Design a protein around this ligand. Sequence first.
Ligand SMILES: *[C@@H]1O[C@H](CO)[C@@H](O[C@@H]2O[C@H](CO)[C@@H](O)[C@H](O)[C@H]2NC(C)=O)[C@H](O)[C@H]1NC(C)=O
Ligand code: NAG
Lengths: 49, 49
Amino acid sequence: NHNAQALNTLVKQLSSKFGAISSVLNDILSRLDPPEAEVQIDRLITGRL
Amino acid sequence: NNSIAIPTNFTISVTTEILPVSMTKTSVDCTMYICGDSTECSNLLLQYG
Ligand SMILES: *[C@@H]1O[C@H](CO)[C@@H](O[C@@H]2O[C@H](CO)[C@@H](O)[C@H](O)[C@H]2NC(C)=O)[C@H](O)[C@H]1NC(C)=O
Ligand SMILES: *[C@@H]1O[C@H](CO)[C@@H](O)[C@H](O)[C@H]1NC(C)=O
């Protein structure tokens, strides 16, 4: 149960914005130009890392 | 090859051994520590999963 719960928590962490406009990379890429989008992608990368 | 040392007397020794068993049980209020009495900070903290 501990291992399964750890994996489930790791999966559910993917819905967090971590301060970005959205938690979905495709939405960030579609709604912003590359330079601005790089900042939001960096925030998501840091959170997921 | 033909000499042996045999004790003719004894001694009763009382030694002391100290072993830790438990430590302090601590609890942390995450919101109070990070965002003590701040609604904006709490709402931003909700973003971090
Ligand atoms: C074995 O050792 C004990 C002490 O560790 C000896 O007892 C002592 O004997 C002397 C002389 O008889 C006394 O002055 C002490 O008061 C004794 N000490 C204690 C704690 O009783 C004992 O005599 C030794 N035995 C042999 C056969 O040598
Ligand atoms: C026993 O010990 C002596 C010296 O302690 C040594 O000279 C001798 O060789 C030993 N015994 C054997 C069979 O080697």
